[model samples]
Target chain A: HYFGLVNFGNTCYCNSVLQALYFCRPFRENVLAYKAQQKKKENLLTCLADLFHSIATQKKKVGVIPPKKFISRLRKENDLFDNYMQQDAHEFLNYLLNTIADILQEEKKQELTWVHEIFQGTLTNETRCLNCETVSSKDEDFLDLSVDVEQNTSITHCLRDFSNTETLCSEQKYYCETCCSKQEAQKRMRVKKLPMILALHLKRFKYMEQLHRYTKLSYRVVFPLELRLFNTSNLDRMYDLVAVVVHCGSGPNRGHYITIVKSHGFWLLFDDDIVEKIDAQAIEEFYGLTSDISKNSESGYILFYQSR
Target chain B: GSHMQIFVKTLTGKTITLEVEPSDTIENVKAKIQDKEGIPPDQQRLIFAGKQLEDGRTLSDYNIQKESTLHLVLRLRGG
Candidate 1:
């Protein structure tokens, strides 16, 4: 149900970036038509965030039912990022928020959000959260997942694939009206490009973390860079990395976060922060690079070179 | 006796409240509700005075006085 997200603005503000990364892409109208019926942006974003957060936070089997807005309100009340974004702060903040709203409206049809196939054949002998018992293949059943029809009236962006119905509604047997009506839906549990990998580069996040600064602060926040634990593996790992935060074992760019989710084998590359654009070769390259890193070093490092 | 009411506003715009003793640390408060809502103590985030809360800390260390409401902030990551 949830897909990977990409941040567009240079680590300055990624709220929009993350939204675009997760929600962008053309949608499958019929499928979305089904989701729109529910009118729950609440559950949707949580499902998406949980899938990705479980890995980011390195926790085992995370559950995402609460909306992030649930947490953001607290951050806002406490005035969290105000002092963090200073330094002749750029207009990146407003831009990020505006962009996310626009992007969500524009790319409403891309429902193949997480690219479910990656998990295909990847997991075996897995078990549900209730108990550590072996999971049965027979348990993989689909749920009706149809959104409530009452909510469909004013829902603007139900599914944006209005162009050629064929592209959006191609394989309808699975989501057809009759099949969906007859079948009871069960709990709904739910990409390659690497050549662009070499073309990909990460600019280190600039820290504007001074007293009273609130404009250009890096989105992920920086604290002179420190070493911490990270999660690995498919169930945990989502997108790929385009770059990594390089802590200065040595200054400056050292100890700052600078990695991309796409390059790290997360998912696809997002456009500026509103579109999911993938260079297939880039996906391949990411897997290869990460495999090489995992086998070779405690942590990976890349040399910075200015374009000639 | 001085008493303070703790109110936290979540991203969803819901305000959750709790009552605490002057000696209780924000971490203690965090631990109490972190799991009840779904976020475990480990994933639970704390923000006070605009700085994100670090692991292993108490209210006395921050010099919180009675009747002072400490704002604990949470952030969303991954997914």
Candidate 2:
């Protein structure tokens, strides 16, 4: 669906993200078909359901999805979210998904939410004591993985670093519950369960203490169109790129969010209301594969990949 | 007087009718379909008589005539 969202006073951040979610067919269908026990005026799920319905059933071919009700409900529910202020798209995505899951749980007592089914994955954190050879492990759930990127690197490199082992020593020694003493440990994280949809966020914004502000990282990080997680036991380790959220501009606070979504074997760039077909050459350039690192240029922020 | 009636069937099973001149390009037809179907022109892959229509080719080049049925398949996400 190439529907635009009307920006209500500096709400481009919300619009861009909401438009991306709207394009996700499965997510849209689930949200639209969700049966809420009660229609809460302050409920984000109901508001979102209504917005999706409007976008799908709207008679006008080229019209905007007015998300005023959703925005108002979000603002009323959360103290941090303001309708007039520009918010972080990634943060908002996380919050909205979790909140919708919570609402579904409370209203329908649903054990598994559509958001969790697609986004949630279990991560195994293992720590081994160097002295006692004792191994301790813990499992945690993650909706999205924030991968650290180094200069002159690829997403594969970043992902390899994600599960790489780390040594803890001196002040950072682990207080082993088994050993009952501080000991040097080797810590590492592994994937316990891979979700249907894998979202990878490139840490492109860095906080600089000298400037006392967040600065954008323009280091060229190459991302593959299809990602394979070899470590995962699942037979389907391949994930294809579905959508990419791109951040344009230099400053962290000032930038536009756009998405390149793959539909019907064609990649289309959706910049606010303007949607056009993107060439393969353009896709390579957007992922910083063909170009040199430059300040204040477009870069990939969030990547949405769906399992094969 | 040389006009073609294009019957476009979308993946959603929605039918769109377009009356186009022989000189009109496939891109022009796609634009009209976009207006009615809400599917962007780029995302539309139109096939007529088992052959995919080229964006730059004219309807006359394809010998498209009245009651020419074109199947519109949308480019979907993922594998």
Candidate closest to the true structure, highest TM-score: 2
Global Cα lDDT for candidate 2: 0.68
Enumerate residue pairs that collide in model 2: A263-B75, A264-B75, A264-B76
What would the DockQ be for model 2? 0.01
In model 2, the Cα lDDT at residue A287 comes to 62
lDDT of 1 by residue, A1-308 (tens): 32322322123233323332322222122224334454445433333344334324444322222324423432343333333331101122222222333334445654212222111111111112122222222112110110111111211111111100111111111111223211111111121111111111111122132431111111121111112111213122222223321211112211211222332234333222232445544333321122222121111122111111
Error of 1 at A17 (Å): 12
Computed on alpha carbons, the lDDT of every model, listed in order, comes to 0.27, 0.68
Angstrom error at residue A256, model 1 = 14
- Candidate achieving the largest DockQ: 1
lDDT of 1 at A293: 23
What's the distance in Å from true for residue A176, model 1? 58
User: TM-score of the A chain in candidate 2?
Assistant: 0.90
Which stretches of candidate 1 lie above 4 Å from their native place?
A1-308, B65-79
